[PDB]
Structures are given as structure tokens and as C-alpha cells.
């Protein structure tokens, strides 16, 4: 499902400030990463990235195409293509704690300025 900025913001509220990344920055990051589409599936080539957060089967989730994956998040990648974001967020938090924000390549180029546009005033 293609969610809106505010729907995403409310859903991921519990991630605001973690590892120093704000909700405005995340709103910006996820739009450029998946267009806020919870069913987004993108080939990176050799690897595949899934859902809102575009979590890769290379190291983070286990897919059918790559079963021998490290599966650091301990979850099937199919659980990352639905509208229940709790498990997606738990995995993103592991990536942030281990690798950091640089996993999300859109951060530096698209979310280093003009962050106020990403605010959701709908509480």
C-alpha cells in the first residue's frame, strides 16, 4: 500500500531520535527510498531490497532466492511487504545500530537540508 507522509510518520514514531536520526529526516529518507510503498521490491542486482525501508536479503532478511543469507534480522523478507510496520522497524533499528544511517544512500544527497517540509502536523 502506498502510504502518506503522515501515515508513515505516525507509524514509525518510536524510531524518532534513535542513533540521532529525527522523524523529519526519516520522512525524507523513506520517500526517496520506496516512495512510501510497503510492497516495494527492488533489485540491486544479485540482491533484492524489500518494503518501506528497502531491507536487503544480502545480509538482513531471508528470501527464497537467497536462503543461505546471514538473516541478521531473523525474519523472512516477505514479512517486510505488508502494512504491519513493527517488524520492519525492529530490523531497521538493527541496521542503524550495526551499520548506521549510511545504509540508506538517499540520506546524504536528499535529506541534508530543507527538512522542515517533511514535518507532519497531523497528530
Amino acid at each position: 500500500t502506498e502510504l502518506t507522509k503522515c501515515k508513515v510518520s505516525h507509524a514509525i514514531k518510536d524510531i524518532d531520535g534513535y542513533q540521532g536520526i529525527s522523524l523529519l529526516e526519516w520522512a525524507c529518507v523513506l520517500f526517496h527510498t520506496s516512495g512510501y510503498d510497503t510492497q516495494a521490491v527492488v533489485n540491486d542486482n544479485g540482491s533484492t531490497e524489500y518494503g518501506l525501508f528497502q531491507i536487503s536479503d544480502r545480509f538482513w532478511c531471508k528470501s527464497s532466492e537467497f536462503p543461505e543469507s546471514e538473516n541478521i534480522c531473523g525474519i523472512s523478507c516477505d514479512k517486510l511487504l505488508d502494512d504491519e510496520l513493527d517488524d520492519d522497524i525492529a530490523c531497521a533499528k538493527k541496521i542503524l545500530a550495526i551499520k548506521g544511517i549510511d545504509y540508506w544512500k538517499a540520506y546524504k544527497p536528499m535529506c541534508s537540508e530543507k527538512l522542515e517540509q517533511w514535518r507532519c502536523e497531523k497528530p
Partner: protein
């Protein structure tokens, strides 16, 4: 004759835009008798200072093109523009390269006429209010500001995709567009970066006048999201000096002059 007025007296404002009824180009020609071979139109009423070349990046979207021609020809004549339509068709089956085809449009249209404005438009976007003039302004213009696909709101302030317009001098100033973005995404953000580096800002109509519809479609095969797009847009400042109009190479396989448009098929290779 004298100069066309500042705002055209023929404008109707808001329009119902729908894609349910089949389109017959023969009917479209019939309804637009004033359009000459090659899809060229010039007011016989007054002299327009806007000599506009409209460039459309293309590959396997013929059904979309039909609706585009059906709706835009009448609109543009109403806006009293001295224009020409150019469809730049990518030959082959390699990754689609939108930005490079737009560069081809700029160079090939200049061979036909002394154009001073270039409107770059995707094939699937139709404006919903004819007050959203398809011409150039004193600063680079972003035209499709409120797409129904984004809830009639701009997705982000730095967005320059869909439909935009650059005067000839604005285009020359940024060394045109990038040639090395293959697959979906990022090339419009790179163009936005180039304009900012040259000290320009983006001009836009308000969201009511800029309302636009995009024909519903799934992603095209061979235009999958580009993995290197984020690394590329992060280095625009250095690549814009050597990648653009000054490094553009391509091969023309065919030039077609139909009554409603000119279609140029080209081989633009692959990304470096």
C-alpha cells in the same frame, strides 16, 4: 499584425481530463486543421515571442502519446505559442535514458527553427488548467506541480520531474542535462542541482493552476530503479562540467514528419 497579448483571450481555465474514450489521431488531425506537417503551429492572429520546442522522451508509449496529442494541441494553440512537437524515441532494448533523449531533443529541434524555449514533457502528463502556460520564464520553470498521483501536491520542494521548461540560455548555462543516468530516478534531481549551482531558482505556478493528471501505468521493463542514482546526484557539481551537451554523442536512425508531430529515433548507447 502586432504582439500577442500578455495573457491569451482564448483561455478556458479548468478542464475535465479523462482517459476512458479511445482516440483516433485521424480525428485529432481533423480537429486541429491549423497544425502543419511536423506538428508545427504559429498564430496567424498575432506575433508570439515564445518560439517553443516541446520535447518528449519516448519508447513504447504510443497509446499514451495519443492522449497527449489529443489534449495538448488544442491547449497550446489557445496559449498562442509558436511551437513544434518532438518525440525522441530510444532505439534498442538497453536501459532507458530519459535525460540523454531530452538532450537529443534540444540539439535536433534547433536544426529546424530558431527556438528560444524548450519544454520537456513526459508522454503521460496532461495539464488540467490552460492558465499553466507551456513556455519559458525568467527562471527555470517547473510545470507539473500538482500531479493527481501525489494528491495534487508537490512531493518535495526540490522536485523538477515530469514537465519543465528552460529558456535556451538557461539550458546552455548548465551544460544541458546529464548523459549517464540509466534506468529510473535521479536525473531530474541532478538537473535541479545544476540549476542551483549556476545560481538559478525554480519558478512555479500555484497548486490550483498547476493541477496535472498522469495516465495510470506500471513501471516499464528496462527502466528499473537505478542503484547508482544517489551516488551520482551527490557529485553533480563536478560531473556537470564534463558530462552534458559538450559530451553528447548519438546516432540518428530515422526522422519522421507526421501531421501531428516529428518523431526522431536514435541510438544513444549505454551509460558510462
Amino acid at each position: 499584425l502586432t504582439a500577442c497579448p500578455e495573457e491569451s483571450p482564448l483561455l478556458v481555465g479548468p478542464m475535465l481530463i479523462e482517459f476512458n474514450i479511445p482516440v483516433d489521431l485521424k480525428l485529432v488531425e481533423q480537429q486541429n486543421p491549423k497544425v502543419k506537417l511536423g506538428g508545427r503551429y504559429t498564430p496567424m492572429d498575432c506575433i508570439s515571442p515564445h518560439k517553443v520546442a516541446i520535447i518528449i522522451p519516448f519508447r513504447n508509449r504510443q497509446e499514451h502519446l495519443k492522449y497527449w496529442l489529443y489534449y495538448l494541441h488544442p491547449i497550446l494553440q489557445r496559449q498562442q505559442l509558436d511551437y513544434g512537437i518532438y518525440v525522441i524515441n530510444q532505439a534498442g532494448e538497453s536501459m532507458f535514458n530519459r535525460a540523454k533523449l531530452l538532450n537529443v531533443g534540444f540539439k535536433e529541434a534547433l536544426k529546424d527553427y530558431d527556438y528560444n524555449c524548450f519544454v520537456f514533457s513526459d508522454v503521460d502528463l496532461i495539464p488540467m488548467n490552460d492558465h499553466n502556460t507551456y513556455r519559458c520564464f525568467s527562471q527555470p520553470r517547473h510545470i507539473s506541480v500538482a500531479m493527481d498521483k501525489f494528491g495534487f501536491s508537490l512531493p518535495y520542494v526540490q522536485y523538477f520531474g515530469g514537465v519543465s521548461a528552460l529558456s535556451k540560455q538557461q539550458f546552455l548555462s548548465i551544460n544541458g542535462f546529464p548523459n549517464n543516468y540509466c534506468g529510473w530516478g535521479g536525473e531530474d534531481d541532478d538537473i535541479y542541482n545544476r540549476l542551483a549551482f549556476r545560481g538559478m531558482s525554480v519558478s512555479r505556478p500555484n497548486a490550483v493552476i498547476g493541477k496535472t493528471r498522469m495516465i495510470r501505468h506500471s513501471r516499464d521493463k528496462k527502466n528499473e530503479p537505478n542503484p547508482q542514482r544517489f551516488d551520482r546526484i551527490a557529485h553533480t557539481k563536478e560531473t556537470m562540467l564534463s558530462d552534458g551537451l559538450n559530451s553528447l554523442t548519438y546516432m540518428v536512425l530515422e526522422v519522421q514528419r507526421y501531421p501531428l508531430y516529428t518523431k526522431i529515433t536514435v541510438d544513444i548507447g549505454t551509460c558510462s
